[PDB]
Design an enzyme around this catalytic site. Structure first.
Site, PDB file in Angstrom:
ATOM      1  N   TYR B 103       0.879  -0.961   0.015  1.00 62.17           N
ATOM      2  CA  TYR B 103      -0.083  -0.010  -0.008  1.00 62.17           C
ATOM      3  C   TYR B 103       1.127   1.185   0.038  1.00 62.17           C
ATOM      4  O   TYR B 103       0.720   2.044  -0.816  1.00 62.17           O
ATOM      5  CB  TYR B 103      -0.961   0.123   1.503  1.00 62.17           C
ATOM      6  CG  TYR B 103      -1.669   1.253   1.487  1.00 62.17           C
ATOM      7  CD1 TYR B 103      -2.665   1.472   0.841  1.00 62.17           C
ATOM      8  CD2 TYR B 103      -1.369   2.202   2.624  1.00 62.17           C
ATOM      9  CE1 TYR B 103      -3.520   2.413   0.923  1.00 62.17           C
ATOM     10  CE2 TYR B 103      -2.055   3.319   2.927  1.00 62.17           C
ATOM     11  CZ  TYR B 103      -3.221   3.377   1.902  1.00 62.17           C
ATOM     12  OH  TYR B 103      -4.083   4.863   2.232  1.00 62.17           O
ATOM     13  N   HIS B 142      -7.148  -0.115  -0.428  1.00 58.65           N
ATOM     14  CA  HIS B 142      -7.315   0.068   1.042  1.00 58.65           C
ATOM     15  C   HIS B 142      -8.362  -0.550   1.813  1.00 58.65           C
ATOM     16  O   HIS B 142      -8.321  -0.908   2.840  1.00 58.65           O
ATOM     17  CB  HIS B 142      -7.565   1.546   1.216  1.00 58.65           C
ATOM     18  CG  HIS B 142      -7.927   1.966   2.382  1.00 58.65           C
ATOM     19  ND1 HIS B 142      -9.148   1.908   2.937  1.00 58.65           N
ATOM     20  CD2 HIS B 142      -7.245   2.542   3.610  1.00 58.65           C
ATOM     21  CE1 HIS B 142      -9.282   2.465   4.264  1.00 58.65           C
ATOM     22  NE2 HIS B 142      -8.023   2.736   4.623  1.00 58.65           N
ATOM     23  N   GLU B 338     -27.078  -5.059  18.048  1.00 59.35           N
ATOM     24  CA  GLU B 338     -26.668  -3.522  18.533  1.00 59.35           C
ATOM     25  C   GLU B 338     -25.268  -3.078  17.665  1.00 59.35           C
ATOM     26  O   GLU B 338     -25.234  -4.063  16.856  1.00 59.35           O
ATOM     27  CB  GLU B 338     -25.892  -3.798  20.122  1.00 59.35           C
ATOM     28  CG  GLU B 338     -26.829  -4.006  20.938  1.00 59.35           C
ATOM     29  CD  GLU B 338     -27.739  -5.081  21.049  1.00 59.35           C
ATOM     30  OE1 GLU B 338     -27.273  -6.262  20.810  1.00 59.35           O
ATOM     31  OE2 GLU B 338     -29.083  -5.038  21.106  1.00 59.35           O
ATOM     32  N   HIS B 628     -29.592 -28.048  52.637  1.00 59.51           N
ATOM     33  CA  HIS B 628     -28.584 -29.143  52.435  1.00 59.51           C
ATOM     34  C   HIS B 628     -29.220 -29.969  51.258  1.00 59.51           C
ATOM     35  O   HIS B 628     -29.966 -30.644  51.167  1.00 59.51           O
ATOM     36  CB  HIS B 628     -28.092 -30.026  53.558  1.00 59.51           C
ATOM     37  CG  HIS B 628     -27.832 -28.961  54.589  1.00 59.51           C
ATOM     38  ND1 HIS B 628     -28.205 -28.764  55.580  1.00 59.51           N
ATOM     39  CD2 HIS B 628     -26.206 -28.299  54.983  1.00 59.51           C
ATOM     40  CE1 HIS B 628     -27.523 -27.925  56.534  1.00 59.51           C
ATOM     41  NE2 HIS B 628     -26.512 -27.576  56.039  1.00 59.51           N
TER      42      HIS B 628
HETATM   43  O1  LIG Z   1      -6.731   3.768   9.068  1.00 62.60           O
HETATM   44  C1  LIG Z   1      -6.088   3.891   7.926  1.00 62.60           C
HETATM   45  C2  LIG Z   1      -4.769   3.656   8.303  1.00 62.60           C
HETATM   46  O2  LIG Z   1      -3.842   4.466   7.444  1.00 62.60           O
HETATM   47  C3  LIG Z   1      -4.164   4.345   6.054  1.00 62.60           C
HETATM   48  C4  LIG Z   1      -3.235   5.206   5.373  1.00 62.60           C
HETATM   49  O3  LIG Z   1      -3.831   6.317   4.651  1.00 62.60           O
HETATM   50  C5  LIG Z   1      -5.370   4.588   5.860  1.00 62.60           C
HETATM   51  C6  LIG Z   1      -6.361   4.334   6.748  1.00 62.60           C
HETATM   52  O4  LIG Z   1      -7.988   4.420   6.570  1.00 62.60           O
HETATM   53  O1  LIG Z   2     -24.561 -26.006  58.066  1.00 59.07           O
HETATM   54  C1  LIG Z   2     -24.001 -26.316  58.979  1.00 59.07           C
HETATM   55  C2  LIG Z   2     -23.578 -25.630  59.814  1.00 59.07           C
HETATM   56  O2  LIG Z   2     -22.291 -25.876  60.606  1.00 59.07           O
HETATM   57  C3  LIG Z   2     -22.383 -27.222  60.947  1.00 59.07           C
HETATM   58  C4  LIG Z   2     -21.251 -27.630  61.936  1.00 59.07           C
HETATM   59  O3  LIG Z   2     -21.427 -27.390  63.175  1.00 59.07           O
HETATM   60  C5  LIG Z   2     -22.586 -28.256  59.923  1.00 59.07           C
HETATM   61  C6  LIG Z   2     -23.468 -27.868  58.698  1.00 59.07           C
HETATM   62  O4  LIG Z   2     -23.545 -28.816  57.882  1.00 59.07           O
HETATM   63 ZN   LIG Z   3     -29.392  -7.478  20.619  1.00 57.76          ZN
HETATM   64 ZN   LIG Z   4     -27.619 -25.684  60.472  1.00 55.68          ZN
HETATM   65 ZN   LIG Z   5      -8.461   4.199   8.464  1.00 60.23          ZN
END
Ligand SMILES: O=C1CO[C@H](CO)C=C1O
Ligand SMILES: O=C1CO[C@H](CO)C=C1O
Ligand SMILES: [Zn+2]
Ligand SMILES: [Zn+2]
Ligand SMILES: [Zn+2]
Ligand SMILES: O=C1CO[C@H](CO)C=C1O
Ligand SMILES: O=C1CO[C@H](CO)C=C1O
Ligand SMILES: [Mg+2]
Ligand SMILES: [Mg+2]
Ligand SMILES: [Zn+2]
Ligand SMILES: [Zn+2]
Ligand SMILES: [Zn+2]
Lengths: 881, 881
Positions: B103, B142, B338, B628
């Site tokens: 380029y 480009h 979007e 549990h």
């Molecule tokens: O984003 C760019 C990078 O640079 C070139 C050089 O011109 C052109 C673009 O559009």
């Molecule tokens: O949820 C509990 C709370 O703690 C005890 C230990 O004392 C055992 C569990 O399973």
């Molecule tokens: Zn969307």
């Molecule tokens: Zn408990």
């Molecule tokens: Zn550009």
């Protein structure tokens, strides 16, 4: 007194996608200062690419810093550099680089005319390419350090080859001392003496003379190699050697034994509390050398014993592993060094062997250590300094280990881990701030966050008893956890999370500094600003807020805007607050950083112009205990109203103002709790688990909105806690150490923890003060911040005196480190009788009577709670020790 | 039905410390598949350094992936490459690269013999350096794209110069179509026709024929340049042009106007619901072109009007700004695109102009858009695909904009942002899992976390009505939020967060798949494992657990170990549980990702060997509602006990087992609530704000521990919520749309929201069903998951029928989207009388009677709650629409 917790680390990627990697160093530009130093990093290069010795500029050195970028400056460009250090050779206040190069590519490719040792002259300003002058040469030169080894009036360098020629792992090499000449600025060879011969020295560490508290006049040299770990030092007249230990034992067919690395760790007043070590060369073994307790300080006067701590796995065909370096630093600021282990990484990959392990000495007596992972990206070398702040926090920098022919960590880079007590994360519109517990940090952290209403709102964590310099009569504070204190002509002034119900505190600090209490503090500091307007605020454009987060917080947080939004437009309005000059700004979760992730407080802001009511509400929607702190009062008349009638009797939609009471909340004041509380301070709860509030609201001062003037206030939403009592009881007790006695001028007995046993649920008793009896047990009685209640905790064990569940007539009493929430059965209201005898009462439960700490009779008497007999609940307090 | 929320993004640094940066592309290796494609990235290079066209290999393509590294593969090495695309030229199933190079360095340094267009041949395996064949040349080439522009049987490429020679911004350039020959494998020039001439074309976008739902046979070309944005397409016989719009108006002395970029955004069935655009060349202006509602689908048949959306700031001396590209993608999976805006960055730095902005169409009718910051690191180009999973989530990849002579973003890099509904962070020993709300996500996310006890515990978020394939009679589930459902020979089986108090559900899914309900679901999936042992578990080494987190979670999480620790050794033991085979494994906070950071549930694990009691406790210490789920029952007899006596009457230290009742919790079952609840299900609260529990514990089956067999169970700790009622009332109501009527076979009136006003606090009434009256208002009556209660919500507005605070005799009734917590005043217990008439009762408050939804009399009758008169509270339900 209390065990120090580790700080948090905010990672920053200092320089990524490196070609290679090997060395990193904390490099202070000046030898007078050690603040926000720069970083020097490099690799060995190759036969194609000379290696750039890069001095990466530290963003946070330039004051009021906006940048997070580390500007690379090529200091030099060199054939296979290996080790480096620095000192002020020109003796002008600038730090010069000393560097070994012309090494070769490996222990199998050693340059016979190489191992050059040179210094690079600091021009005193950040230009690239510094002038280079050769000091000396010795093939295989592989480590060095600068210091004062035989004199003080001149820079000296100790330099050591690891091997003397290609593939030769058996010939020992010369420990070389180079001396600066008087005018180092003339190119000429530096004077050299050889001071010893060693096999495979892989690390040199140094202990500056100044650190030995007058033990040494000169720096000690600590060598790790195949001979193990030893200490070499000069006394003024001669060199002497002290063997610390022999390191890994040899195993046949493996040329590597002894040590690969070693550092010397401070413990309290002893600069050498221990020596840690990594074994052998590039090995997988961590060990520590200890000295019997009661040993003399330092190294040379104690005999050392080796204890193997971990082996991180086997070695490969080259007989190597994953450990390259150990260093010592004081990571949590408690006055003893931790040590870091630089994990190179492994083939095949293994997190266990990648990054940094941090080992903590948990038991000074038995020399037991425990480990934590600090980082999990390749660490080939580790450097410590404070890279961001003035305090003595310690940040860790690392560089990936990538060296052709040994191990090459993919995506090699330099990173730094910034020690801090506050970490910030974007959620969506609000920021998550995680905080360390103040009680266990040894470091002050400040982090500014929002510039608004003439103020820089700053989150601050303080360690216990820490000092904060402020601007007298200007600086304002609001405590979220803990307590802070100041003094002026009137005495102490204390700030807690919430003042007395319906009360009104000034936030203004009227002294030159404040101090945090026993538990430290977590608070918002209101710094005066010139960048966010000046009251009176006549329009909302005037109150535009600015993002204050510092450059090391992540970018997605730094990029956040915090607009004011009219309350009508918020998604929770549902058609309410139309036409009100009533605005909202969100927002900040302040939460504990630890494994509980528990809330500390949610914080948001509001405004209201003249005549505007923020709407009567009652918080049936979401549960919390709110405190407000007004920044600017539009009129000097704005403030909080609550209804004084029952709730059925008040119409929030068409409020009868006369059924309310007003508390003006002046510029920079905060109000007390408005929610309903039980008489000892626990919050009334509704049936759906919300804190119970009467109808209440912020109303701006009345009048015409012209000219306009805005109230601006901050909301602190805490989870439930116990506050002050109703009514406030008289102060009849000093916090202190006490014996707690029952009986008369005839025969008495004292409060005791059975056999002083620390176990949860140990009984509490009254032990007859016998003839040749034990002496009375000591209890620490103390005041619960923000309440009118006291706690009694066993002086030896820590155990709180606590009534067993449930607190009823005749319930037994015990010790616990596992109190009920809001200390329901382990806090006490005190009364003093006319005799001077103390009573301890429980929070009074819904339908039962008062229950007092009591003996049960008149060889231990058991201790119950009861409330029928005054006589059994009167105690005498004798100051104890 | 409900607005879609954005997913979360996990950033991964794909390749850092780049020399330069410009182009990034999602590159599928095969043209048959679009799964986990690779990434192609590069910059223009310089006159010294030819630029490496790097094909970075996608880790998550290799199944059961361990790596987070993107292995770079040099595809080619080229003088100033600019634009690229791909297609299958050899027509073999492999994607070939097409690339413009030679380029020059800038619009001021255009190579007169350059602008080469070449394709690179995909050898069908990942070797480097692909064979290159020239297609054509045109100076200043480009941008380009591949597709079918005049035929289908052959690859064609449209290619456009931005300028024709150095510094010439006024000469228009040729829109070139290149055609593949029949054997592209012979080096020869490709056939070319010029199809138009344009000024400063800076972007080419394409609409594949297949996307137009039969509108076009061939791809449309959309050009953005100084002529504005236009559409060029072929009909089989001729080219035609349709002007979308003219873009930025010219301003004198500024050579840049029109458009710099443009994309075409789907909305529902219309592949071109809108066209977004960035203006002008490298400009700071975002705009969107719209078509009147009721326009035909596509581009060429509607007239387009331009609406300026933002200007991100002024332009510099070169007349440029910070916007380089726009693209469209469906980010939140709701079926409308979007658009992303690639912010190059700025001089001086500005977050507002750095990274990616994501604009959402919030209002399809009025074409209003709103924006969110997705990333704040330089984006020079943006590529979308699903880089990690099989679903239709959309990840974003970016490359820093760094081009000598334009703008050079410091530390240039490639990053990808992985869309996910689950994000993982290490706290300390426990992991924080943030989750999106299931109701508003359109994406299934699974994240495995712990391999333990023969199972792979996997966190799963499901969108409403989503399907989950499972292993019949093997897969187990546990719902944390929402509901899931399955069917077998017996009917539906539903799982909610907690089954009926004291009950016991199987977690095993007995069908080939389940489905989530209306609110989606968040659950733990128990996948069968072979990598974590097989019951019976005879020792704790057998139950060693393994970290399961996938390679894109951060490393510090992947490096975590989760050991079992004996309960005695935990820091909360305080000398308890000595000698018990009783172990614990922590741990996982599952919390909502949004700004509330609200808890969902904390999760941890336990074991107990034969004869072991886990200790009777009552949760006075910390507040929560625990469920549990047993994974393995050591004996088939282990389970939960609670005391059936009041608390004073039970000694937790020396338990009288006969005062308890046992619920065996078999392999892969979960039990119902054990805490105390009010009769409609709200939890009893103690005075210190803890959920009130009777003494309870997990006890292992009795017997001798030889041979040993471990109970293993998981604990789900929820914050308070309403559960089921006591007793369970009869089902007398179907969820549905209804008119709610009062009166008899004579004169009736229906329940109504005054003027259907959506505002919180609008009154609820009974409007006499008059002569020529309004028709009866429709209410959605629905069942509250996990409860026996119902909610009545206004069909049009969404407003819940709710009693005003406080619920007392004669209290008024209103509509709200702001219910009290646990819906205290907006949920209802239903009874049906013998006539068939329905009653709606409030949760019965502590000291007041039942209060029913009621009319107040016999032109609106107001609606109160009361409970003295049956007659005023009987309602008839007529199915309504
Ligand atoms: O984003 C760019 C990078 O640079 C070139 C050089 O011109 C052109 C673009 O559009
Ligand atoms: O949820 C509990 C709370 O703690 C005890 C230990 O004392 C055992 C569990 O399973
Ligand atoms: Zn969307
Ligand atoms: Zn408990
Ligand atoms: Zn550009
Ligand atoms: O760590 C390294 C790197 O490689 C050199 C070459 O032998 C020596 C070391 O100790
Ligand atoms: O704390 C609150 C609660 O919400 C109101 C708005 O109704 C205002 C405050 O200051
Ligand atoms: Mg100097
Ligand atoms: Mg092909
Ligand atoms: Zn080494
Ligand atoms: Zn320390
Ligand atoms: Zn309030």
């Amino acid at each position: 007194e209390q065990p120090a917790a580790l700080p948090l680390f905010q990672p920053q990627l200092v320089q990524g996608g490196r070609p290679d990697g090997y060395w990193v160093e904390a490099f202070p530009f000046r030898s007078d200062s050690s603040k926000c130093p720069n970083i020097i990093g490099y690799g060995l290069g190759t036969y194609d690419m000379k290696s750039d010795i890069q001095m990466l500029v530290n963003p946070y050195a330039t004051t009021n810093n906006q940048s997070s970028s580390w500007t690379p400056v090529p200091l030099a460009k060199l054939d296979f550099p290996v080790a480096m250090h620095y000192a002020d050779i020109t003796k002008n206040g600038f730090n010069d680089v000393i560097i070994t190069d012309q090494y070769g590519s490996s222990m199998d490719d050693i340059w016979a005319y190489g191992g050059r040792v040179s210094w690079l002259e600091n021009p005193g300003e950040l230009r690239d390419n510094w002038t280079m002058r050769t000091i000396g040469h010795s093939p295989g030169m592989h480590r060095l350090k600068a210091g004062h080894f035989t004199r003080t009036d001149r820079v000296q360098v100790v330099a050591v080859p690891i091997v003397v020629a290609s593939s030769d792992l058996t010939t020992p090499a010369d420990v070389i001392i180079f001396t600066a000449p008087d005018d180092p600025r003339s190119e000429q060879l530096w004077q050299r003496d050889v001071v010893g011969t060693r096999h495979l020295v892989h690390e040199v560490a140094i202990v500056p003379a100044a650190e030995t508290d007058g033990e040494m006049r000169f720096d000690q040299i600590i060598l790790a190699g195949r001979d193990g770990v030893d200490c070499l030092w000069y006394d003024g007249a001669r060199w002497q050697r002290h063997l610390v230990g022999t390191g890994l034992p040899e195993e046949r067919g493996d040329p590597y034994w002894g040590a690969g690395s070693a550092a010397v760790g401070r413990v309290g007043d002893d600069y050498a509390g221990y020596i840690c070590s990594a074994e052998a060369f590039h090995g997988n073994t961590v060990s520590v050398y200890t000295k019997p307790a009661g040993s003399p300080t330092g190294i040379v006067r104690a005999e050392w014993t080796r204890h193997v701590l971990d082996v991180f796995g086997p070695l490969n065909g080259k007989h190597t592993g994953s450990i390259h370096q150990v260093v010592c630093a004081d990571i949590d600021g408690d006055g003893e060094d931790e040590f870091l282990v630089a994990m190179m990484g492994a083939d095949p990959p293994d997190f266990q062997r990648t990054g940094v392990w941090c080992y903590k000495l948990v038991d000074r007596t038995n020399m037991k250590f425990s480990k934590t992972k600090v980082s999990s990206v390749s660490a080939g070398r580790i450097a410590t300094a404070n890279f961001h702040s003035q305090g003595s926090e310690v940040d860790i920098a690392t560089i990936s280990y990538s060296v052709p022919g040994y191990f090459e960590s993919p995506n090699p880079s330099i990173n730094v881990f910034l020690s801090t007590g506050i970490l910030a994360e974007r959620l969506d519109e609000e920021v998550m701030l995680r905080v360390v517990r103040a009680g266990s940090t040894r470091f002050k952290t400040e982090m500014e966050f929002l510039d608004v209403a003439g103020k820089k709102l700053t989150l601050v964590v303080l360690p216990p008893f820490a000092r904060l310099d402020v601007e007298r009569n200007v600086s304002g504070v609001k405590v979220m956890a803990g307590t802070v204190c100041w003094a002026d002509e009137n005495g102490k002034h204390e700030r807690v999370p919430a003042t007395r119900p319906f009360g009104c505190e000034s936030m203004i600090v009227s002294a030159d500094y404040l101090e945090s209490g026993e538990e430290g503090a977590i608070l918002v500091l209101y710094k005066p600003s010139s960048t966010s307007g000046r009251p009176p605020f006549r329009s909302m454009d005037e109150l535009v807020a600015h993002n204050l987060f510092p450059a090391y917080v992540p970018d997605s947080v730094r990029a956040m805007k915090f607009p004011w939004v009219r309350c009508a437009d918020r998604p929770w309005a549902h058609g309410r607050f139309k036409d009100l000059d009533f605005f909202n700004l969100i927002g900040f979760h302040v939460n504990f950083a630890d494994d509980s992730a528990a809330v500390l407080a949610h914080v948001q802001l509001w405004t209201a112009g003249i005549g505007v009511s923020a709407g009567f509400h009652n918080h049936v929607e979401a549960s919390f205990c709110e405190i407000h702190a007004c920044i600017a009062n539009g009129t000097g008349r704005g403030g909080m109203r609550w209804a004084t009638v029952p709730d059925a009797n008040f119409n929030p939609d068409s409020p009868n103002l006369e059924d309310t009471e007003l508390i003006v909340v002046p510029d920079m004041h905060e109000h007390g709790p408005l929610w309903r509380t039980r008489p000892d301070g626990h919050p009334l709860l509704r049936m759906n688990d919300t804190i119970d509030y009467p109808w209440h609201a912020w109303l701006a001062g009345a009048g015409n909105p012209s000219p306009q003037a805005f109230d601006v206030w901050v909301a602190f939403e805490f989870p439930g806690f116990e506050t002050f009592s109703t009514p406030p009881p008289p102060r009849v007790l000093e916090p202190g150490r006490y014996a707690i006695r029952f009986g008369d001028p005839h025969q008495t007995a004292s409060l005791a923890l059975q056999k002083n046993d620390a176990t949860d649920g140990t009984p509490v008793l009254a032990l007859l003060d016998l003839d040749g009896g034990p002496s009375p047990q000591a209890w620490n009685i103390s005041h619960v911040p923000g309440t009118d209640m006291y706690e009694i905790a066993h002086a030896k064990t820590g155990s709180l005196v606590c009534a067993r569940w449930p607190p009823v007539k005749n319930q037994r009493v015990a010790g616990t480190h596992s109190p009920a929430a809001m200390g329901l059965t382990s806090r006490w209201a005190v009364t003093k009788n006319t005799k001077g005898q103390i009573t301890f009462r429980l929070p009074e439960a819904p339908d039962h009577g008062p229950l007092f700490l009591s003996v049960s009779a008149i060889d231990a008497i058991p201790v119950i709670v009861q409330g029928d007999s005054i006589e059994l609940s009167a105690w005498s307090l004798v100051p104890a020790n």
